[PDB]
């Protein structure tokens, strides 16, 4: 029930700033999968990774629409520590990076649908996701580390430019959880 | 330790009671304002779907699932009341029995939107504006005395059965998943995500 | 020269308000390369219909090879439904946005049997200069200037800066673009 | 007829004056206030490119290759006063030897934007709230006495050569494809469209 | 049974040296697939033409393999009527061509399995043919033109000397029947 | 019309009769000379399935499903005596319990053939050059006192439901269908063929 | 000249009665492709390994583009059982009969998906030499001296003589092929 | 030692002697006895080509390429009189401008076997039966007072000049590698061998 979530929550608050390990957050976000499926409106039901043989992948159960999600760890830097010019801060390039790869295997994983699909018909496996759009979501950072208000303001001028990445960090994923919590009680 | 016990208790109620209405009545209703009343009285559950602490209904703003009252009766008054609710979240409830898509075909294994739902989405995001140019005009006038608002926008319409195919869901996909800043969801697909909950709380 | 392009304006005031036939446009365009080059900042290079093979076009980038698929509709293709959903509401018209979806849906297409077309292409000896990075579509239909009203230019409006990749372009902006190339320099 | 002549051979010359320029100087100057004083000497070219008659670099405004002079010396004053100009094209010239991604790999294939390309990208998007930020004050001060610009923001910097991989273009695709309101155009493909203007003129 | 066994032997007999069409003998067979299912010792049972888009296609039940048959009329020359040297007959052009043809053919059903697979998927098609050995056969002409000796000893070797092909003329197909018919009585 | 209607009885009766003791003991019995001696009554359908009115089971020639008698007792002196035989098919009949293959893979999906099923193609192989040589052997001695058969070789041993995977399927495919001179058929497939022509009848 | 054929020739009388090493006749072969040429009469050329990508060579025809793909084992593998199935009749040994199919299912495979290792071979900038067309394939194994007996060889001689497509031929068969080309040089 | 280098020598010498022949005359004679009589004096390329030390060239023997002296003038008599050579290469050579397949297309993209070629094939195997008819009469006449050879089959014809069109290589690939007794290599193919003899050679 809800000790769930305060569970997760704790387990969330240990390994804010002492774990740097994607597989660790991997194996957190796999074995509770509704942390991810809570960032969509829609629903979404996870994807096993033999189906489309760090990254994973939600469908929805309606439309076979899959999306492709990155999972970075909170220790990413959002925006390099230094300053373009005075007051305009660069995001870091892990982000760009991470968005970059989010975006090639996305386009990778659409180019490759019929051998994928060919392979699941051949072994039994039964494919439940279409690559109808490019969207993507990448996962990195916090927004905490981000004190000054040029930090805030460059960051969030920088996610907003994205056509269909969309960009969530780690606190603000887990403050949906946070926000559960607050809307039961 | 006993009062989280009570809460999933209460939520699990609540969204039973919800899914139970919707079953009861997803094929006999089709007023709007019946279905806007029965998602008024369970907007946490929008609030949680959504991910946003502060929805909009019609012209009454809601936070955190509690109906925010508002004495001048202006949802602008409160918007601009609270800088906490400046990027809340606009929902139009139409009726679950809205077509999606044209009966029709506009070519082969091409589907074109339906006149309804492409004008509840112009009609959303006129309410937006409209929202905006009253806000900045209560802005100006208390410069004159001595931002932007900017909120999402929501559209739920339709259900998926009546996409009884994959050119269907590919056509509907391609249209709602295009809007920048308008997000289309289902009754279907709402009440799925409820269950899903549902399941998430056992 | 400049009178090149005025005869091309010239046979576009003539059939706008008469031509209602797809394939007249297809090859009006398909004679001038360079009209449609003038939407994109970036350099594009027509790509032949053999290359890659309902009227469509491609053009790519000369230096990332970056294809952009266009589709071109007549200039009389309504944009806004006539009649209004609600009291200054306009809904677009459907033509318009199945368009949208078809130019989208050619180009998932495009994108998934882009192995068997650049096998094909080295087979038979072409060269494949396009490549499918990113989803962007161009759509064109209809002219700007029959929508009279306000509340149509707005939803207009509203329906053409909702979209994410698909541009939709009116004709009399397409060709007002090479007049106002004309009226550059004069 | 003859006039129509002299004026393609008056636009020729200056095309091929400029492309002089740019191949005299393309691996020589770097001085970013060196091609900021060339282009924008040229304006009506950068107008056709991108396709808008109103053209903004730095401090001064261009109508149509045409400069305007604003005596009060604030480009929003300028902007504030023409109602056409709220569609124009904010452009910041950068030195072409500037990088465009990283030449570290970040993985297998992928290349993260370069520190300098997103930097200017962040530096305009600032300008360009600023100067929202300030239509807004004027806006402001001439009601209290008795719209939102939006301008278009683009960025010229680097020369398409230095991606020599596929990856390198691929990477650089993926990153200038998915801005929404800032468009980055190397100088490279900037004197490719000039020459491409010069062969439909000639 | 029996009579229909005469009925398909009367109807050989009628179009035996008048009917040169094609079509017209694949109609024959088409209608009776036991007429080719004798052919082949193992049992094989015929491919639907939608399955892998004059020829056919007979598969084994239990291994799944398939062996493509071609089908020309009974009036194809077996040998050029010159000889290559005294009581040395060529085999005819016809023959060598259909089998070259039936061959090509065999080899690209085998190079464009995955995707004619994939497409009996997508469309709900059951593939039931498996391009496991290269095996075909070529239907043509009649044995009865051959009347010389020279003749029979030319063709014989001809159709001795190939490996992967089995040229067997019209008359052999139907007075196969005819033995079963023999046999029966 | 009634003779033609009564043989086709009686050949149903006798193929009906060929399945049901097939399959009464398809597991149990075992024994490679009771499938010979229940091979032997129905000759002709061995006649038809390999294509060759005469066939050679053990030292016994058949002609058209008849028992020819041959007072010799020696196979060859038959084999010389009617010229019109000169290509018999020589069948050599195994047990429908032999393996095909053997069940430890030679690697991966790759399974070798079992020992049985490559000694009875030797021993047919070796049977043929037998009866080849004492041809031989009778024609120079008659040649003394004043040509070569090159018969058809049959194996027929096992049944397919041993090759219950994939590759147990196509290697034993790769395998049989290499040969030459011999022609492999299991037991099932056998039967199965006369069940066709069961069906074929009716 | 000479004095390479007697190296190998050497190297292989050294190697034969003790080596069991699949790697280490692989190796010696792939150092030297005249050696594995012999076998057939038309002209073959070596295709690289990472081409078309247990031990299998590659042969192609440079004329006619005909791919022959040839398998290699130890001269140690048993020909046949060194049991008896009847009085003189010796069943081949299942090493033989494995890697028969072995290598025909490497070839039926190698066949059905060359499509993509031609597309993969273009895209890579690497020219596909290779281009399937026949069913044949060579496996390279045993010697034929450990046949000592005269069923032995008969029933040998009936296995290898009675396969279709693929040739079984011994290492002492291919080397004294290359010993046969010494002694006609001489 | 020096023997070796010097059999080098003579070897090289030989193979560039054949190689001028052929390239003196590859277009200009179309005799075929002179091509015959050519090969005939270095008929131990042919004798490693096709892995047999005796080649029977027309009714001549070669043992290793040496000229057997058979008084006789019979090759079945030599044939006979050794039992070693009972597998030798029959080798029947025709002009190198023999065509390869007609000109014509059976279908779209068939190219049937040319007349010349599938009667040289024919011719060879006529020959081989003959051969074959001699020596069974001759073992039979020995017999009396008090084997089969099956040699194999070699046609030379033709260059792979004619055939550009891939169809073309493809049918005559689908053609000659689908004899089982006989082997046809063109004249290119096999001066091509030669040629790659040299190189292994030097």
């Given at each position: 029930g809800i000790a769930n979530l305060k569970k997760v929550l704790s387990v969330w608050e240990s390994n804010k700033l002492t774990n740097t390990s994607e597989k660790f957050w991997q194996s957190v976000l796999k074995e509770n999968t509704w942390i991810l499926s809570q960032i969509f409106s829609n629903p979404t039901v996870l994807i096993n990774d033999e189906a489309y043989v760090v990254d994973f992948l939600y469908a929805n159960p309606f439309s076979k629409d899959a999306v492709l999600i990155a999972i970075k760890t909170?220790?990413?830097?959002?925006?390099?520590?230094?300053?373009?010019?005075?007051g305009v801060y660069s995001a870091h390039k892990d982000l760009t990076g991470a968005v970059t790869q989010v975006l090639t295997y996305k386009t990778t994983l659409q180019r490759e649908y019929q051998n994928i699909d060919y392979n699941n018909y051949r072994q039994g496996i039964k494919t439940?996701?279409?690559?109808?759009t490019p969207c993507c979501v990448v996962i990195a950072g916090m927004?905490?580390?981000?004190?000054?208000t040029a930090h805030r303001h460059s960051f969030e001028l920088y996610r907003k430019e994205l056509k269909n990445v969309t960009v969530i960090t780690f606190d603000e994923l887990f403050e949906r959880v946070k926000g559960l919590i607050k809307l039961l009680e």
């Open positions: 909170p220790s990413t830097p959002l925006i390099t520590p230094t300053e373009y010019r005075t439940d996701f279409d690559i109808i927004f905490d580390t981000l004190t000054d």
